[PDB]
Amino acid sequence: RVRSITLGNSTITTQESANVVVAYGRWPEYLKDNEATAEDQPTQPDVATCRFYTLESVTWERDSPGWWWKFPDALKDMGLFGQNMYYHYLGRAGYTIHVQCNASKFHQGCLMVVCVPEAEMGCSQVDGTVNEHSLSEGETAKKFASTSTNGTNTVQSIVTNAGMGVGVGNLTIFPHQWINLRTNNCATIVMPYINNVPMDNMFRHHNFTLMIIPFVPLDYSSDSSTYVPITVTVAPMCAEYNGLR
Amino acid sequence: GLPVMNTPGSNQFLTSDDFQSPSAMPQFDVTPELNIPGEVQNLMEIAEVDSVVPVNNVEGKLDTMEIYRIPVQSGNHQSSQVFGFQVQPGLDNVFKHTLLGEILNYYAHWSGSIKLTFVFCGSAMATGKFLLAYAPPGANAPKSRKDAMLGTHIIWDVGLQSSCVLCIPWISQTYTSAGNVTCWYQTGIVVPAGTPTSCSIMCFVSACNDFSVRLLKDTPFI
Amino acid sequence: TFVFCGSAMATGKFLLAYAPPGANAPKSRKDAMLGTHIIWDVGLQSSCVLCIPWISQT
Amino acid sequence: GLPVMNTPGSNQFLTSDDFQSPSAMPQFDVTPELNIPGEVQNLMEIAEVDSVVPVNNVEGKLDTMEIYRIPVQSGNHQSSQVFGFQVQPGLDNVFKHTLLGEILNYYAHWSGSIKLTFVFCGSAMATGKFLLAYAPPGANAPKSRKDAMLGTHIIWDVGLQSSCVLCIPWISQTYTSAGNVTCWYQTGIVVPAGTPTSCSIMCFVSACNDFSVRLLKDTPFI
Amino acid sequence: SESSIENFLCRSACVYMGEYHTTNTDTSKLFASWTINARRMVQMRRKLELFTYVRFDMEVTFVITSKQDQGTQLGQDMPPLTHQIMYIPPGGPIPKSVTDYTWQTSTNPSIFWTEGNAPPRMSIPFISIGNAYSNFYDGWSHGVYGYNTLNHMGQIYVRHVNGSSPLPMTSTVRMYFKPKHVKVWVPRPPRLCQYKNASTVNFTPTNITEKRQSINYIPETV
């Protein structure tokens, strides 16, 4: 009851009892042919964009508020998919995201894993503006805080308002999955391309945001490990660019 | 030509009228629609989604993640209450800011059925029993574990199931005249050596398919 | 094939990564994630399998 | 008779309304139409015509015929630039006053493909090679002859062909975010004894059949 | 049925009220202007933020009232006043005085109206080179965070239509706005914090809900 999956020259292993969320019922696909027939011809890499990219693990401790990543540009240094971001003026893609934990039966805790489109964030100063570095750091995660933040140009990252001004118990409206250390330790989310235009430039726009948020904190006792590792793996799907010839 | 007679109501501006209007840009062909995933036809598609209830809305923790966690304590307390609330979406503080509560507050009359889910977030070594009890509107809340057993209840063994589900059938709106839900320790929680002592429960609320709303009004939150 | 020989109560995650011939070995967890890899949860599976396709010698 | 009721909007004058009006000269039969050559149904018939681009719009010659002539110099300069511009009809000074530019400036949104033609006006004894290169929007302009060769380009031998044609596919409007075109000396120009030394190139622009415009507005030129 | 998208969003509201004079010594008080967006009406803003992408037509009605200034001069006998209401599409010329040339451009649609009649009304289509409007943008304008240029919807300008040396008068205009034929995509959670300004999502941290007495407290039943 273990499946082994190979994309390109990558191989990972999952359990065949996985559960998969397809975001709004829609699988990813190519914009078919004839939105812009004449002088808008696209191309597709399909070479080493369809392959598993694995980020660094994060460390879940007793007081961890949460983590977030921006897509794309979490992959702007990831081999070929990142090269294509510099060579081409427009693009699009869907994604498959796997999130996994490594824990024992003597640990306990609960995580929400959610993919949020257009996650526009607020500044720590009400009459201020957010910086580009405070929104993302690429393949390194940003951190939520457990109290309200200060300083100039920083996202106001108190975890109960999720940086967007809503109640964090209501983020289940988005494509999401629960990880309860008692019953499962994995989550797969398949995201299609969602925009109000068919293609776009991939450097000054963040299509979506992946967030991981503990709702019940990690607990252990006498001589268990004091942390739990979380691992994120991403495979781009049906990527497509403007033709160069 | 064509004899004609003007009726009362002529040349008035009624804010809710429905008439054909002249276009100011007739020679402009609009961008065709795109097939964007995730289209909505009705607000009841938003209320049928689960959202986390802040059941622990007491002093000192209204601004932390702790507001969402029902505490299960360690040791032997096998007849004490765990929690209890009245089921009043829209009006009551614990249900007021959920996805279902926020919708209902746009309408002056609503009615339907409600779904509550409970999930145990402890270690896989812990076992024990809870008693979940429902009192209808017009009935007092039970005061002991025994009279909660004498009504409508379910006995929930967390060593067997991690989650329980309830569906409540007679919900309307306007010292409440509403039904209530309570939870009691049947046994107490039992663990082996080397597992955490305390733990937590979480509540999710949603609406069932037969939910209706009437008389759009203004919301009291902005 | 890799097999985890710990107690049945332990949980966690590993990242297993493969670099082809002519490529340097990854230096961090993040650039190993950006190549071919599998994420292995030992609370779910006790063993993982890999098949490597282009093997020759000097 | 015929009960009738006046709606809001009655007795107003809307500048873009469309109603039947009473004729002031009903007993007057009009002159029948003549079949005059050269009738027009649509403004895109004007934009599909070539017109000469003033590529040499530098100081000291904005009021002479020289504004239209790209200079080709004599001797050996076989890696230097000849010219370059961004492709931005409507906004950019070199395309702004052409037949295509003047139309586009009546509309607030437009899009399509564009056609550029280059013609060599030297003596029939001259030979040489040029490199014509296209960079898409979001790309920097090439700095050398070699990196222009590493992109999309055509090599144009004027001893064989007197003219070259280019079709550019992704044109829209609003430190530009537009594509560009550049020209490089591949070899240099070679002549026999008794022919003029210098010479010229000319550019023509036009629109291709798939061109569209929206939101008629006022032009900023009078 | 009352929770459909059309019945929830398609409702009229006053979004701008402005004043303008016939004679003044400021020359910006001689006309009134408004930029069309749906972010400075706090009740419409919140209902619109439940979705990520929207598509609609606009309908605008104008209520206009005048007054003679309390300055000094009485015994007047005046004909009814005429007003001009001009819509500028995205990518159009903007007036800066009331005597400007742009009040006469053929591509800015305009309405002429005299008092005493029914209130004037114009209908604007979906005007965007994109396929939908967006309520949320996680990007840069090219640089402002959260602002994309596909959301431009135009402007409205109002003046008096007198001749030379007019008599002093003060007018007030109220604009009533209504979206029609609406479609929405990707639902979102409701805004929990108060809005701080009209262009950002900035906020001060807010409590999740209000407190009660204890986690067991249910109020006494009547």
PDB file of N, CA and C in Angstrom, chain D residues 1 11 13 22-23 45 52 60 63 72 87 90 92 96 108 114 124 141 155 185 190-191 198 218:
ATOM      1  N   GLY D   1     -58.880  58.023 -23.782  1.00  0.00           N
ATOM      2  CA  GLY D   1     -58.912  56.591 -23.973  1.00  0.00           C
ATOM      3  C   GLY D   1     -57.528  56.018 -23.943  1.00  0.00           C
ATOM      4  N   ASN D  11     -39.469  63.310 -21.049  1.00  0.00           N
ATOM      5  CA  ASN D  11     -39.230  64.724 -21.368  1.00  0.00           C
ATOM      6  C   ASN D  11     -37.805  65.146 -21.082  1.00  0.00           C
ATOM      7  N   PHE D  13     -33.729  65.314 -22.466  1.00  0.00           N
ATOM      8  CA  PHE D  13     -32.938  65.270 -23.691  1.00  0.00           C
ATOM      9  C   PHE D  13     -31.635  64.524 -23.412  1.00  0.00           C
ATOM     10  N   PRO D  22     -39.691  64.466 -36.509  1.00  0.00           N
ATOM     11  CA  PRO D  22     -40.546  64.994 -37.584  1.00  0.00           C
ATOM     12  C   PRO D  22     -39.744  65.780 -38.610  1.00  0.00           C
ATOM     13  N   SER D  23     -40.024  65.530 -39.879  1.00  0.00           N
ATOM     14  CA  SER D  23     -39.304  66.220 -40.936  1.00  0.00           C
ATOM     15  C   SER D  23     -39.871  67.619 -41.136  1.00  0.00           C
ATOM     16  N   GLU D  45     -10.124  50.399 -43.225  1.00  0.00           N
ATOM     17  CA  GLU D  45      -9.637  50.460 -44.591  1.00  0.00           C
ATOM     18  C   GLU D  45      -8.602  51.555 -44.775  1.00  0.00           C
ATOM     19  N   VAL D  52       4.846  56.234 -44.854  1.00  0.00           N
ATOM     20  CA  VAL D  52       6.275  56.326 -44.597  1.00  0.00           C
ATOM     21  C   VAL D  52       6.517  56.777 -43.169  1.00  0.00           C
ATOM     22  N   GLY D  60      17.500  69.040 -35.662  1.00  0.00           N
ATOM     23  CA  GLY D  60      17.996  69.723 -36.834  1.00  0.00           C
ATOM     24  C   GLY D  60      17.358  69.301 -38.129  1.00  0.00           C
ATOM     25  N   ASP D  63      11.986  69.269 -40.024  1.00  0.00           N
ATOM     26  CA  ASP D  63      11.215  69.985 -41.029  1.00  0.00           C
ATOM     27  C   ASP D  63      11.754  69.800 -42.443  1.00  0.00           C
ATOM     28  N   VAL D  72      22.880  54.955 -44.570  1.00  0.00           N
ATOM     29  CA  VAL D  72      23.827  53.856 -44.668  1.00  0.00           C
ATOM     30  C   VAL D  72      25.142  54.460 -45.112  1.00  0.00           C
ATOM     31  N   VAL D  87       8.322  49.272 -30.753  1.00  0.00           N
ATOM     32  CA  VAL D  87       7.132  49.207 -31.587  1.00  0.00           C
ATOM     33  C   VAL D  87       5.914  49.581 -30.752  1.00  0.00           C
ATOM     34  N   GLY D  90       0.694  54.799 -31.892  1.00  0.00           N
ATOM     35  CA  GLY D  90      -0.161  55.555 -31.008  1.00  0.00           C
ATOM     36  C   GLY D  90       0.589  56.377 -29.989  1.00  0.00           C
ATOM     37  N   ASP D  92       4.392  56.293 -29.415  1.00  0.00           N
ATOM     38  CA  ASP D  92       5.776  56.663 -29.678  1.00  0.00           C
ATOM     39  C   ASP D  92       5.880  57.649 -30.831  1.00  0.00           C
ATOM     40  N   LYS D  96       3.611  58.018 -34.414  1.00  0.00           N
ATOM     41  CA  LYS D  96       2.453  58.708 -33.867  1.00  0.00           C
ATOM     42  C   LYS D  96       1.620  59.412 -34.926  1.00  0.00           C
ATOM     43  N   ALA D 108      -9.615  54.436 -27.231  1.00  0.00           N
ATOM     44  CA  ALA D 108      -8.931  54.205 -25.975  1.00  0.00           C
ATOM     45  C   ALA D 108      -8.440  52.776 -25.803  1.00  0.00           C
ATOM     46  N   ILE D 114       1.009  44.012 -36.705  1.00  0.00           N
ATOM     47  CA  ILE D 114       1.537  45.129 -37.482  1.00  0.00           C
ATOM     48  C   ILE D 114       2.510  44.635 -38.540  1.00  0.00           C
ATOM     49  N   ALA D 124      22.245  50.103 -58.170  1.00  0.00           N
ATOM     50  CA  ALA D 124      22.117  48.693 -58.486  1.00  0.00           C
ATOM     51  C   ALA D 124      23.440  47.950 -58.452  1.00  0.00           C
ATOM     52  N   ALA D 141      16.763  45.399 -25.259  1.00  0.00           N
ATOM     53  CA  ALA D 141      17.267  45.497 -26.617  1.00  0.00           C
ATOM     54  C   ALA D 141      18.688  44.945 -26.682  1.00  0.00           C
ATOM     55  N   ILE D 155      18.534  37.684 -42.019  1.00  0.00           N
ATOM     56  CA  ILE D 155      19.707  38.239 -42.686  1.00  0.00           C
ATOM     57  C   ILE D 155      19.313  38.673 -44.092  1.00  0.00           C
ATOM     58  N   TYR D 185      24.929  46.090 -39.112  1.00  0.00           N
ATOM     59  CA  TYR D 185      25.823  45.823 -40.237  1.00  0.00           C
ATOM     60  C   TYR D 185      26.414  44.428 -40.118  1.00  0.00           C
ATOM     61  N   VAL D 190      29.711  47.429 -50.425  1.00  0.00           N
ATOM     62  CA  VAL D 190      30.803  47.272 -51.374  1.00  0.00           C
ATOM     63  C   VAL D 190      30.316  47.745 -52.737  1.00  0.00           C
ATOM     64  N   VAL D 191      31.097  48.603 -53.387  1.00  0.00           N
ATOM     65  CA  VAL D 191      30.710  49.204 -54.665  1.00  0.00           C
ATOM     66  C   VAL D 191      31.870  49.121 -55.643  1.00  0.00           C
ATOM     67  N   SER D 198      27.514  56.658 -50.213  1.00  0.00           N
ATOM     68  CA  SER D 198      26.502  56.550 -49.172  1.00  0.00           C
ATOM     69  C   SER D 198      25.160  56.136 -49.774  1.00  0.00           C
ATOM     70  N   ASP D 218     -11.794  61.534 -27.841  1.00  0.00           N
ATOM     71  CA  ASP D 218     -11.382  62.733 -28.550  1.00  0.00           C
ATOM     72  C   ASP D 218      -9.878  62.711 -28.792  1.00  0.00           C
TER      73      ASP D 218
END
